[PDB]
Amino acid sequence: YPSIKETMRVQLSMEGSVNYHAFKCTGKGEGKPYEGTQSLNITITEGGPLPFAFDILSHAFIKVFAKYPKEIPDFFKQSLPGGFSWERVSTYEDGGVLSATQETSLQGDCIICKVKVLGTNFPANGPVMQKKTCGWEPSTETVIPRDGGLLLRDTPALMLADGGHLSCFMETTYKSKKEVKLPELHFHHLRMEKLNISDDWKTVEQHESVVASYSQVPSKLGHN
Amino acid sequence: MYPSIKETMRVQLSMEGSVNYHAFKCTGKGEGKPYEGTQSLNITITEGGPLPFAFDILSHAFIKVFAKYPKEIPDFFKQSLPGGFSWERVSTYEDGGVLSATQETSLQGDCIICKVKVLGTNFPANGPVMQKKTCGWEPSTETVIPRDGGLLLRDTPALMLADGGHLSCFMETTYKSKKEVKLPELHFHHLRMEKLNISDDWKTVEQHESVVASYSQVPSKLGHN
Amino acid sequence: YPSIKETMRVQLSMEGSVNYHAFKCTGKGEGKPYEGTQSLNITITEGGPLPFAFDILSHAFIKVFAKYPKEIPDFFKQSLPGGFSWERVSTYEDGGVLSATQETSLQGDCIICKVKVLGTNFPANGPVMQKKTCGWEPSTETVIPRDGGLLLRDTPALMLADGGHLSCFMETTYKSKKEVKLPELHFHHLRMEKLNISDDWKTVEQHESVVASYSQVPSKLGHN
Amino acid sequence: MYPSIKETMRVQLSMEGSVNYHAFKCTGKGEGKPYEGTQSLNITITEGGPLPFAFDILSHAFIKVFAKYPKEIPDFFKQSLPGGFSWERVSTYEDGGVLSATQETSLQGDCIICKVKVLGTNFPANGPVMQKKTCGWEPSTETVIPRDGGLLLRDTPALMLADGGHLSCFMETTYKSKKEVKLPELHFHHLRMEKLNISDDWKTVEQHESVVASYSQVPSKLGHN
């Protein structure tokens, strides 16, 4: 795809608040867009050590890094040169709601990301606010074409310190500055993991691998 | 090995309920391959005449015994079949509709008997469901989560519309076995449920389904499944 | 309104299931439709001891009994002779969902109610399934006119044994068999209370008072 | 009858945020009678030109200090003003849209200062909010619930539409006080919030609100409030 090299650089900035607590973050990283892998070194610049689980911000911290087959239009690689944006509502089973908005642009080999986050109504004595989470499980997101843009839906499961799971629903919208050849309905298979965390809980390395594809299960109706 | 579950198993199903003020009954006669993960069901609407709502909203309610499971992942449904198990579900549509369901699964001979109860409300009067503007479900992936000696299954299936778009719903399904069973770790079901035939008289519909259970095939840096 | 006396009788039948548990209930009672008051003696006829709190069934156990002012059309009293029906989704903050459908008809002075209920996804160790509820608080429901029928919305709070509250969102639809005159948007002010429970826990007396009204806070735009 | 709360108070407000990709900023100057439960706010959109979405979805975010409280019900908001308090809200619209908000309230002299932050997403691009076909909010009743040292307020307000119908949303708002405050028992807020004057350029909006707090009007047979 035009102006997308085998290895790309990432610059990220994030600001916002969760349950009365304001914070700011920055990200330095790289990855292989065609191989579908990426890494991000995240420093928390404002708001000290977070009083809530860092995990609830992980989804917000670039679908450019996604392995796409020849047969399926890659919305994200097409949209990058002209720029694109995404917005998300993440609704947790115990009451928490995390809203996010993001702008993505390209300057040379640098993918610059600007994120705004707003979270409210997280149970004060729940796993998120008490920092009793242990990273997300792998998941698969449904990519739905909707009027010029995309709508992505997922039900990711967050691992808990007690050995259980906290689930949330995700609804993500995508809008491109330029007009792009839309894909048919398909899936993203994700695995997002925290590799390293600094002692003071300020610096955290996050990795992600993404494979895009149609369903693996055969059709009786000749459908994808 | 599962002694009572053969290569081919037969299905006897009964459904009763109502959607948007309209009561109905359905019966199902089917067969499947539990280890291949394939099944077929011949559905006849016995009461409530021709349905005033899209049949597609009943399809998920019409048996996870027919799922291809790998050796390394415990099969809850095959383990639970002899003793009997039940499932319950809330399906929440993006435009207001909510469909509730409860089901009991038991085994008599090689016949898997299913008793389903359905209750749907608040579907918009001029929406695609109540105007029958739906064109079957897309394939989907369901997340299988162990909880409290049972299972919690979560999905975001997409329903194809006559206009060429999609109507999405959220599904949350609970599972309870009568006997204590060995619970699997978190994993996935990859599904494709298709109507092979819809009779012209609105009385009969053949429905097929293939299911594959698996962990994520995307590599882990933490050595996680 | 025709065929509606000062005092009317009630006959009710309920069937359904909550969290895998099938049950049946019957109701015998009376009330004053214009005074907006009613009493119902509920006997649990099938399903032995209920494993869930009886409180979650209380809303499903007759809007005919509502004190209506002259300036607001009474949908329920208009619809009663010809018959009307209602359907409801009650979504609890901790995951439980109770679905209901009901038919209302008149035979003489006897209001006949046929209810079916389907409840799922209630947390196994939550206050509902552990029966740690203590009746509902009073509430106020918003009556919204919508295409020949009604949509009613409420956010009722259920009192808990611990002293806190468990809240749910209610969305109730109404359809009349004969076309009636729809009101403008207004409110119901409700108080539904259990007055008595039998020693064998099979019989419970439930009382309800309802007052319909526009908002009592003054308008600057001359709006109701 | 409350410390630091005069019969008339002034309001200084700042708002910044975004709805459906569109960023904006707003300032507000106003006044009201706290004990009478009435207030007015003169709002100017300083950044983001004329909003491409309905102004109505911001109205709730634009001060519960202005609420008529009876003697027997503890006034959380008047108690919490001198030390300062904060609130946060999720507003979920029936057609998909979600508006998240956070706010900080403090007092300097007779000036109630408000810092608001808004984030709205997933509103239907062709829905009444994004196409600006709303006609102000109906009056409503909010449920005040005491919950762990603070408050939980729940509401289902109805937004009037241009076609003559309604668009409803669910409101869940939390309140946290800086200082420890005497909590009330469960009760209700009866609100009416109206736009009085709007400029032709859609930059300046005058908003008025009246609030009456009370227990339920309906008699009890159990002797409860």
The answer to whether the CB atoms of A146 and B165 lie below 8 A apart is yes
Question: By the 8 A CB rule, do B27 and B116 touch?
Answer: no
Residue D102: enclosing H or E segment and its boundaries?
Answer: strand D98-108
Put simply, the answer to whether C218 touches D166 (Cβ < 8 Å) is: no
**Which backbone phi and psi does A24 adopt, to 5 degrees?**
-140, 145
| Closest among D208, D210, D206 to D42, alpha carbons compared | D206
Name the residue with tokens 């119908």.
D165
- D41 in helix, strand or coil? strand
Strands B98-108 and B111-121: antiparallel
List Cβ neighbours of D163 (8 Å cut-off, separation of 6 or more). D128, D133
Using alpha carbons, select from B60, B51, B58 the residue that is nearest to residue B202. Answer: B51
Find chains touching chain A: ≥3 CB pairs under 8 Å: B, C, D
A124 min Cα distance to partner chain B (Å):
23
What subunits touch chain D, counting only 3 or more CB pairs under 8 A? Answer: A, B, C
- Angstrom distance (rounded) from CA C143 to CA D165: 13
Task: Count CA within 13 A, CB hemisphere, residue B201.
Answer: 6
**Chain B CB contacts of D96 below 8 Å:** 94
C-alpha to C-alpha distance for D211 and D189, rounded to whole angstroms? 7
Burial pattern B145-179, b for ≥16 Cβ within 10 A else e, equals bbeeebbbbbbbbbbbeeeeebbbbbbbbbbbbee
Nearest to D97 by CA among D72, D67, D126, D139: D126
Please count the other Cβ atoms lying within 10 Å of the Cβ belonging to residue A147: 11
Structural determination approach: X-ray
Angle at A53 between CA A48 and CA A58, to 5 degrees: 95
Beta carbons of A37 and A83 less than 8 angstroms apart = no
Q: Give dist(CA B211, CA B68) in Å, integer.
A: 6
Say if CB D215 and CB D187 are below 8 A apart: yes
Cβ atoms of A61 and A219 within 8 Å: the answer is no
Asked if B9 is an interface residue toward chain A (Cβ–Cβ < 8 A), one would say no
In angstroms, the Cα distances linking A63 to A74, A209, B157 are 10, 10, 21
Contact A218 B145 (CB under 8 A): no
The 3-state DSSP class for residue A152 equals strand
d(CA C90, CA C168): 6
Query: C129, B180 in Cβ contact below 8 A?
Result: no
Q: Are A26 and A45 in contact (CB under 8 A)?
A: yes
**3 state SS of D193:** strand
What are C144's two structure tokens? 């919204």
DSSP string covering A181-192 = -PPPSEEEEEEE
Q: In which element (H, E) is residue D77 found? A: helix D76-80
* C-alpha distance from D142 to closest chain A C-alpha (Å): 17
Which residue is it, tokens 């409210």?
A: A120
The β-bridge partners of A150 are A145, A174
Q: Answer yes or no: are the C-beta atoms of A188 and A210 closer than 8 Å.
A: yes
Looking at the DSSP assignment, which residues form a beta bridge with residue C146?
C149
Contact between D86 and D116 (Cβ < 8 Å): no
- Work out the minimum CA distance from A215 to partner chain C, whole angstroms: 29
Q: Which residue has the tokens 């003020």?
A: B21
Nearest residue to A45 (alpha-carbon basis) of A205, A202, A199, A200: A202
Is C116 close to B18, i.e. CB distance below 8 A?
yes
How far is the C-alpha of D183 from the C-alpha of A199, rounded, in Å?
Answer: 39
Nearest residue in D to B94, CA atom: D96
Helix (H, G, I), strand (E, B) or coil at B86: strand
Alpha helices in chain C (DSSP H): 75-79
3-class secondary-structure state, position B77? helix
Of A20, A101, A116, the CB nearest to D88: A20
Query: How far is C-alpha A17 from the geometric centre of its chain's CA atoms?
Result: 18
The residue of chain B with its CA nearest to that of D169 is B96
Burial of residue B63, with CB atoms counted within 10 A of its CB: 0-12 exposed, 13-18 middle, 19 or more buried:
buried
Backbone torsions φ then ψ of B224, nearest 5 degrees: -90, 155
The minimal CB distance from A142 to the residues B147, B152, B158 is found for B158
Q: Which residues of D touch B125 (CB under 8 A)?
A: none
Q: How far apart are the first and last CA of chain B?
A: 24
Nearest-Cα distance to chain A for D123, in Å, is: 10
3-state SS assignment for residue D153? strand
Nearest to C99 by CA among B91, B157, B57, B115: B91
Spell out the residues 6+ positions from residue A5 whose beta carbon is closer than 8 angstroms to its own: A33, A109
CB pairs under 8 A between B and D: 3
Residue C212 DSSP symbol: E
Contact A60, A115 (CB under 8 A): yes
Q: A27: Cβ–Cβ under 8 A, 6 or more apart, which residues?
A: A10, A11, A12, A13, A14, A40, A41, A42, A43, A61, A113
Smallest Cα distance from C25 to chain D, Å: 24
Gap between the terminal Cα atoms of chain A? 24
Would you call A57 helix, strand, or coil by DSSP? Answer: helix
Left if phi > 0, otherwise alpha if psi is -120 to 50, otherwise beta: which for D48?
left
Q: Which amino acid is at C129?
A: M
Q: Do residue D119 and residue A101 have CB atoms under 8 angstroms apart?
A: yes
Q: How many other β-carbons are positioned within 10 Å of the β-carbon of residue A106?
A: 18
Contact in structure between C60 and C42 (CB atoms under 8 Å): no
Q: Tell the burial category of D88 from Cβ atoms under 10 Å away from its Cβ (0-12, 13-18, 19+).
A: buried
Interchain proximity A93–C93, CB inside 8 Å: no
Other CB atoms within 10 Å distance of the CB of residue D44: 13
Q: Cβ–Cβ contacts within 10 Å for residue D122, how many?
A: 22
**Cβ of D51: how many Cβ atoms within 10 Å?**
17
Residue B58 identity: L
- How many CB atoms are located within 10 Å of the residue A107 CB? 9
Pick the closest to residue B174 from B141, B148, B192 (CA basis): B148
Q: Provide the residue type at D67 as one letter.
A: A
Distance CA A138, CA C158 (A): 37
Paired residues of A212 in beta bridges? A188
Q: How far is Cα D114 from Cα D107, in angstroms, rounded to an integer?
A: 9
Q: Which residues contact C171 (CB under 8 A, 6 or more apart)?
A: B122, C88, C89, C151, C152, C153
- Whether residue B170 and residue A169 make contact (CB cut-off 8 A), yes or no, is yes
**From CA A64, how far away is CA A74, in angstroms rounded?**
9
Question: Cα–Cα distance between D210 and A109 in angstroms, integer?
Answer: 56
In angstroms, the CA D176 to CA D188 distance is 18
D135 touches chain A (CB under 8 A): no
**Residue type (1 letter), A217:** V
Contact C157 D168 (CB under 8 A): no
Instruction: Work out the minimum CA distance from B89 to partner chain C, whole angstroms.
Output: 6
Q: Are C187 and C214 in contact (CB under 8 A)?
A: yes
Burial class (CB in 10 A: 0-12, 13-18, 19+), C124: middle
Using a CB–CB cutoff of 8 Å, tell me whether D143 touches chain C: yes
Q: Do B94 and D96 touch (CB under 8 A)?
A: yes
Chain A residues with CB-CB distance to B191 below 8 A: 217
Cβ neighbours for D49, distance < 8 A, ≥ 6 positions apart? none
CA distance A21 to chain B (A): 30
DSSP H helical ranges for A18-72:
none
Query: Degrees (nearest 5) of the Cα angle C55, C59, C63?
Result: 155
Q: Which of B97, B107, B44 is closest to B77 using CA atoms?
A: B107
Question: A95 CA to chain C: closest CA distance, Å?
Answer: 7
Which residues in B lie closer than 8 A to residue D94 (C-beta atoms)? Answer: 96
Lookup: tokens for B17: 């309920």
Is the sign of the CA dihedral B65, B70, B72, B73 positive or negative?
negative
Closest-approach residue (CA) in chain A for D172: A121
Q: 3-state DSSP call for residue B79?
A: helix
CB B92 within 8 A of CB B156: no
Question: What residue has token string 């670039």?
Answer: A62
Suggest the residue from A153, A213, A219 to mutate for an interface test with chain B (most B CBs closer than 10 A).
A153
Smallest CA-to-CA distance from D140 within D168, D102, D175 is with D168
Chain D positions touching B94 (Cβ under 8 A) are: 96
- Between the alpha carbon of residue D166 and those of residues A75, B124, C83, C146, C147, the distances in Å are 36, 14, 26, 8, 11
The C-alpha atoms of residue D187 and residue D193 are separated, in whole angstroms, by 19
Contact at CB, B96 and D94, closer than 8 angstroms: yes
Q: CA C86 to CA B215: how far, in whole Å?
A: 44
Radius of gyration over alpha carbons of chain A, in Å? Answer: 17
C85 close contact with B: CB closer than 8 A: yes
CA–CA separation, C107 and A206 (whole Å) = 69
Query: Which CA distances in Å does B149 have to A58, A165, C120, D33, D72?
Result: 30, 14, 17, 57, 49
| Tokens encoding B15 | 């459904």
Of C135, C144, C155, nearest to D154 by CB-CB distance is: C155
- Check CB contact under 8 Å for C87 and B21: yes
Contact across the interface for A93 and C95, Cβ inside 8 Å: yes
> How far is residue C21 CA from its own chain's centroid?
21
Instruction: Report yes or no: D117 at the A interface, CB cutoff 8 Å.
Output: yes
Which 8-state DSSP code applies to residue C10?
Answer: E
End-to-end CA distance of chain D: 23
Contact D168, D159 (CB under 8 A): yes
Q: Retrieve residue D62's tokens.
A: 């634009």
A13: number of Cβ within 10 Å: 14
Q: What DSSP state is assigned to residue D138?
A: P
Q: Are C134 and D186 in contact (CB under 8 A)?
A: no
Show the domains of chain D with their CATH numbers.
Answer: 1-225 (2.40.155.10)
Q: Are strands B22-33 and D158-161 parallel, antiparallel or unpaired?
A: unpaired
Q: How many CB atoms lie within 10 A of CB A110?
A: 12
| E strand segments, A97-185 | 97-107, 110-120, 133-136, 139-146, 149-154, 157-160, 165-176
Which residues are CB-contacts of D91 (< 8 A; sequence separation ≥ 6)? D57, D60, D98, D99, D100, D101, D169, D170, D171
C97–B102: do the CB atoms touch at under 8 Å? no
- Distance (Å) from the C-alpha of residue A17 to the closest C-alpha of chain B? 27
SS3 D84: coil
Contacts with A94 from chain C: Cβ below 8 Å: 94
Instruction: Give the list of residues 6+ apart from residue D78 with CB closer than 8 angstroms, or none.
Output: D2, D5, D34, D65, D69
Sign of the torsion angle spanned by Cα atoms D79, D81, D86, D91: positive
Chain C neighbors (3+ CB pairs < 8 Å): A, B, D
In the chain, the amino acid numbered B30 is G
Q: Can you read off the two tokens belonging to residue B96?
A: 């207001």
Looking at the DSSP bridge assignments, the partners of residue A168 are A92
Q: What is the dihedral of CA C59, C61, C64, C69, to 10 degrees?
A: -30
CB < 8 Å from A in window 168-207 of D: 172, 174, 176
Please list the residues that pair with B12 across neighbouring strands. B29, B113
Report the C-alpha gap between B206 and B200 in whole angstroms: 12
Q: Is C79 helix (H, G, I), strand (E, B) or coil?
A: helix
Chain B residue numbers touching C171 (CB-CB < 8 A): 122
Is the Cβ pair C89, B121 closer than 8 Å? yes
Q: C204 forms bridges with which residues in the sheet?
A: C42, C197
Check CB contact of C87 with chain A, cutoff 8 Å: no
Least Cα distance to B211 among B6, B58, B10, B70 occurs for: B70
What kind and span of H or E run contains C106?
strand C97-107
Query: How many whole angstroms separate alpha carbon A141 and alpha carbon C177?
Result: 44
- CA torsion angle B79 B149 A160 A115 (round to 10): 70
Q: C157–D194: do the CB atoms touch at under 8 Å? A: no
Q: Which residues lie below 8 Å from residue A199, measured CB to CB, with a gap of 6+?
A: none
Which value, to the nearest 10 degrees, does the dihedral of the CA atoms of residues A193, A199, A201, A203 take?
-60
Query: Chain A within 8 Å of D101 (Cβ-Cβ)?
Result: yes
Residue entry with tokens 């928490």: A96
Chain-centroid distance, C-alpha D49: 23
Distance from CA of D107 to the nearest CA of B (A): 42
- Whose structure tokens read 């819809």? B198
Kindly identify which residue of chain C lies nearest to residue D40, measuring between CA atoms: C220
Chain breaks after residues in chain C, where C lies over 2.5 Å from next N: 61
Alpha-carbon distance A152 to nearest alpha carbon in chain B (angstroms): 10
Residue C151 sits at the vertex; the CA angle it makes with C83 and B130, to the nearest 5 degrees, is 80
Provide the shortest C-alpha distance from residue D100 to chain A (in Å).
7
Best A32, A217, A219, A221 member to test B by mutation, with max B CBs in 10 Å, is A217
Helix and strand element counts for chain D (H, E): 1, 13
Q: What is the 3-state secondary structure of C162-188?
A: CCCEEEEEEEEEEEECCCCCCCCCEEE
The answer to whether the CB atoms of A157 and B140 lie below 8 A apart is no
Letter for the amino acid at D164?
G
